[PDB]
Amino acid sequence: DLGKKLLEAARAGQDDEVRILMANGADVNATDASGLTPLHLAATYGHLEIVEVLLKHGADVNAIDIMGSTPLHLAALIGHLEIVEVLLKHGADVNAVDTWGDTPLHLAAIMGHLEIVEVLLKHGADVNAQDKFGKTAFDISIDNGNEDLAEILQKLN
Amino acid sequence: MREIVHIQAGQCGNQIGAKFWEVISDEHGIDPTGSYHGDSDLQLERINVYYNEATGNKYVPRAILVDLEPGTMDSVRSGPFGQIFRPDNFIFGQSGAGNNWAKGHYTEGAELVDSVLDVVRKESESCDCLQGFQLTHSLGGGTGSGMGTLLISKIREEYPDRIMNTFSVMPSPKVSDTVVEPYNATLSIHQLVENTDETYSIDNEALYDICFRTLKLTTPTYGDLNHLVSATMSGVTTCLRFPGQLNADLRKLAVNMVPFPRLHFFMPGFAPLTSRGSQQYRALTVPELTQQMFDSKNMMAACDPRHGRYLTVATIFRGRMSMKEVDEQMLNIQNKNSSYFVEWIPNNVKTAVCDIPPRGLKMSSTFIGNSTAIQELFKRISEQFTAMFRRKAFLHWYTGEGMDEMEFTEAESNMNDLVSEYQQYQDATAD
Amino acid sequence: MRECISIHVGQAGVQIGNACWELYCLEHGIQPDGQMPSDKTGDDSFNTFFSETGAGKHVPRAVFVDLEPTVIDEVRTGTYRQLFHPEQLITGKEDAANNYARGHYTIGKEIIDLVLDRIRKLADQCTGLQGFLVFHSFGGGTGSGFTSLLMERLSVDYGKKSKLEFSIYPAPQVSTAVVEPYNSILTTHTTLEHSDCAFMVDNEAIYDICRRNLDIERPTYTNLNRLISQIVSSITASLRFDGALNVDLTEFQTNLVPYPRIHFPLATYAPVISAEKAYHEQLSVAEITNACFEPANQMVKCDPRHGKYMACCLLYRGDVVPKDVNAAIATIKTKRSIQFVDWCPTGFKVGINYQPPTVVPGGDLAKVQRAVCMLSNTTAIAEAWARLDHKFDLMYAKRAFVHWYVGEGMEEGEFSEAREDMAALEKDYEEVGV
Amino acid sequence: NIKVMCRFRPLNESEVNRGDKYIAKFQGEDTVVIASKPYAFDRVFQSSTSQEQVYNDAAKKIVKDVLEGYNGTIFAYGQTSSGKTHTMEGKLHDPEGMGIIPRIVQDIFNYIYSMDENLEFHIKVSYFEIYLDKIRDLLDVSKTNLSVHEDKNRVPYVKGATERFVSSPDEVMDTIDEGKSNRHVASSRSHSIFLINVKQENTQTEQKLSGKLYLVDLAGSEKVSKTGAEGAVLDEAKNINKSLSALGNVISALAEGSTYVPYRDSKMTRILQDSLGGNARTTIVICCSPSSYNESETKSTLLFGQRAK
Ligand SMILES: Nc1nc2c(ncn2[C@@H]2O[C@H](COP(=O)(O)OP(=O)(O)OP(=O)(O)O)[C@@H](O)[C@H]2O)c(=O)[nH]1
Ligand SMILES: Nc1nc2c(ncn2[C@@H]2O[C@H](COP(=O)(O)OP(=O)(O)O)[C@@H](O)[C@H]2O)c(=O)[nH]1
Ligand SMILES: [Mg+2]
């Protein structure tokens, strides 16, 4: 199966094998056993060109794996700024909620990705979105003592 | 309780270790050639604790320099006190650990470990009365974290009756090289909780905030961060290096500071906090030193002391001052903030005064706290570790080095359990 | 003689021992190398404490033990480097790290047989050994642990001999360990049945006297030790001079200990005067005797007006006429409310040593014409045990630091057994003082 | 919750002529008076108390829970000649003289067989000792350093421990005997843990149960000052003492209903973590000698039981 092969290529960042595999009819929206698609994999592992190509050819920007993780969750978690911007440009849901009640804003804030937090806020990240323990990205910034993050999270108006 | 064997592992470990050797050599009047040139017998009274006496009245650090990366030796050797180190004490690999704990702990590190242990053995056999081991390393990388902790478990099994002490640098995204730093640090804390007696938590989050927010350094460098580290390292070892009554050795310090075996992570504090090349226009008074060393802004771990309670405190005052005024300020801090010091550990704050001030300061104070508020540093790392672990990001980088996924679950359980243990004693009452 | 052997265990024991012997040499006219001039008389009072060699050298019947060398090295190198038997200055390398369990077993076991073999060497040079005087701290790992191992071993090897203690009770002003109350309770528990009489020296009481009477801002160990050595000298003088009260070790138990477990008398010394405080008129017999009933002058912080007396001894030194002592006692009996237990005799035993009291030249204490040390067994001293028991209870309830002792071979139940013995002791003082 | 049960054995011929007097005075059926101080426990069994009466009060409910799929733990503590062997195993094949273990094993196989209609049972046994802080398999002499690991749900388990299938009460006794022959003994110099895992599969309902019964044999606390233990013996004594402290810290935390329970204090408390926590009943059986000479070591056994509460 070419679906399995495309998942491996996008993960490893093999741009050429991604092109070749798709050309032979590989499902651009194939899923592994946990529901990750080539797009979740390229977005996690920072392959910008692969993300752009998948999106240009039918990849569902808001596909969820078994845990509710969208490609945006993963790019916000890992700190890939250009990928976050490309996903948002392609209609990524800024406020997608996974199984832990996390949104991309929670993940960028936990990981200290400040530029991504600012980008997400400008695209309408919900500042009041609570995780399974009732925490917002702001509650995280204040319980952590992260003043720089607290400042950006309050700047709204 | 004479000799301490010093080990420095990885890039950070060898950077902060080098700085420690430069600072203490200047304090003891030892030049880069290993010759004594000072003007006080107090400098040499306890010189044997960190230095071996070589032939021709030379003093040589009891230091072992370790790394998997090659260019680390070159960088240390080119340094001001580079030539003071014993050449045979340099154990350096050529492959590197690629910021991976598993590479440091199981692969590249396991290939270099026995040759490090032979040098550790040569140094230990020549000791009249070995106190134990002091290791400098970071927790966020591969060598210092993975190989450093591998060395710690191997040294503990060979020397079970010696104290194991660490200066452990905690990662921060404000400083950071990678997203895998919460993995490397959590994996190392699981080792530290079990195999060290005393750990000084040197937090990069705290160092960066001091440099940026207090010292107004717009773009803090490693050299700016290390200026704070070297002040702390000098301060926390004053009692081991100069004549005194209090915490004069590693085991007396541990018996005073550690009420519960796992709760051995210390919050270091220092006053005054300065930038490199900053002119001192006045010396701080005893009341100012007391207030500042207990101030959250002066802590080397990004934790607020008011959010927890002190189990035990060691306070060191340096310079010429009144022992009566020190006594009074120390009594006042405790009595005015009494709810912040556990009532079930009476007289848990111990004070030492050392006549010799550090370089450039007429007066200084170092704080060593065992506070339940340190659970905030462990909560920060655990939260980032859990954020990454839930999504299984980069796990193959670790399991590909042999490592089982179960070791991540175990390290996560351990850190959460430590946080719960601090919380328990923070809510404990003498009813 | 009637020889007594002094044993100094750990830092406190050693440093106090240094000050005591410095003072005994001054009192008996012995030089730092053991030599004594013209007026020799074998048949000398101080022979109970000093043997005599060939060259006319008087050597203390003293042993110094520490699990670390630093303190004893100072003795081997100082003014008295040639005073003691060099084989009677014994040191290990690795100390007890403020841990009773290390002094008592894990570390102490390595040196105990050497210590007993060295004690035996001094004991063999004795024609009529009375027993031992043991100096140590309650708080240190060696002072606490090593002393109780030693006391246990001496009880087996010298069953019929008296053993006396000079125990340094902890104070937070000079304390170097958080675990000092654990070590104090464990040592008290194990030593209780092996000691016949023990003189507690509360570091806080000595510290307060140095601050209030000697005007010392921040008292050092040198300041405390010189004062303590003065008081110990006042207690031991009867053994070293040919007096009538407390002439032998057995007599301390007879006069001060009617109940075996209640063997902790209170020492009150007067007058303590600053050498820099000139010029005051000399204190009379009445003034120094009245000063014995003032809590400020006690070696231990407690209030005897709260408790009851079982025994009372007054030991004078200097220009003291017996009639003036008799008159001052009658004054005290009427004017003061000194309550004795409804079974012991309401009497004050008196001793007088006519030698002017001696001080260290250049020290903080002024040379006085007459001095007194009152030795009384009062139930009020139970307060000092209550303060220690309280600190122990606060930490033990949380098992704080217990892993250190358990890590050194101790079983946790030993903490409970020791604390029950302290509770039985507090009750013993309650039952007597009623 | 946790229950502590004290058992006094009758006096033996070796100490009858020794002229020792009975220091053991009793109150109610829960209190034992030694030297005018009382000692309250969940139940105090006198010398006259049968093996049947001892088993019913201390182990019978735990056995029912294990057969119902829940966990339970039984600890046995006592110095040498206290009565551990007699209480826990006794005359292994005799119906009256048999202790606690043959009774547990009797009751388990009496539930088994009686359910053969839709149920499929598998009885798996494990036997390990903690000696010098190492987990040694008593069923495989090659496995001398087993490690405690966690599954995906943080539950600690002993990795690679032998799991012997047992189809009869005699098979269990033979396994205990085989393991006993592998135990480090100078008087035990290690803690012993015997695991009885009762597995059941309801063929028609497709629902599975797995109840764990832990039988812990505790070596007595050693006062190392006395005995004069050195080298490996001293390392053994420290290890036994450390483990008993850890255990005391764990049961104390569970008794006070603390949010933090220090299972991480020992490898023993971590092996027993799942069976000590939550919906699990635990009994600590402490064996005492009533002799006037044993008053020291008996008051030591009594204070350990008090620590549990
Ligand atoms: N008065 C007096 N007390 C002292 C002196 N030295 C120490 N202490 C007290 O003794 C206690 C500490 O015990 P140490 O005697 O120093 O310790 P140690 O017996 O040598 O035992 P370790 O060092 O633990 O092996 C504290 O209460 C100190 O304040 C001294 O010279 N004089
Ligand atoms: N404070 C401080 N942190 C450093 C220094 N060098 C590296 N680090 C930190 O060390 C961590 C891990 O990196 P490193 O020691 O370089 O890796 P290793 O060579 O594999 O041990 C990261 O969190 C870095 O921020 C230094 O000189 N000072
Ligand atoms: Mg000492």
Coordinates of N, CA and C and ligand atoms in Angstrom, one line a residue, chain B residues 245 252, chain C residues 10-12 66-68 71 95-98 140-143, ligand 3:
Chain B
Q245 N 32.6 26.2 61.2 CA 31.9 25.3 62.1 C 30.7 24.6 61.4
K252 N 27.9 16.8 56.4 CA 27.3 17.7 57.4 C 26.2 18.6 56.8
Chain C
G10 N 34.9 14.2 71.4 CA 34.5 15.1 70.4 C 34.9 16.5 70.5
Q11 N 34.6 17.4 69.6 CA 35.0 18.8 69.7 C 34.7 19.5 71.0
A12 N 33.5 19.6 71.5 CA 33.1 20.3 72.7 C 33.9 19.7 73.9
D66 N 38.5 11.9 69.3 CA 37.6 12.5 68.3 C 37.7 11.6 67.1
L67 N 36.6 11.6 66.4 CA 36.5 10.8 65.1 C 37.0 11.5 63.9
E68 N 37.5 12.7 64.1 CA 38.1 13.5 63.1 C 39.4 14.2 63.7
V71 N 40.6 19.1 65.8 CA 40.6 19.7 67.1 C 41.8 19.1 68.0
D95 N 34.6 11.9 60.6 CA 33.7 12.2 61.8 C 32.3 11.6 61.7
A96 N 31.5 11.8 62.7 CA 30.1 11.2 62.8 C 29.1 12.1 62.2
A97 N 29.5 13.2 61.5 CA 28.6 14.0 60.7 C 27.3 14.4 61.4
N98 N 27.4 14.8 62.7 CA 26.2 15.2 63.5 C 25.2 14.1 63.7
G140 N 26.6 16.8 69.1 CA 27.4 16.2 68.1 C 27.3 14.7 67.9
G141 N 27.7 14.2 66.8 CA 27.6 12.7 66.5 C 28.6 11.9 67.3
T142 N 29.8 12.5 67.6 CA 30.8 11.9 68.4 C 30.5 12.1 69.9
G143 N 30.3 13.4 70.3 CA 29.9 13.7 71.7 C 28.8 12.8 72.2
Ligands
MG3 MG 33.4 17.1 65.5

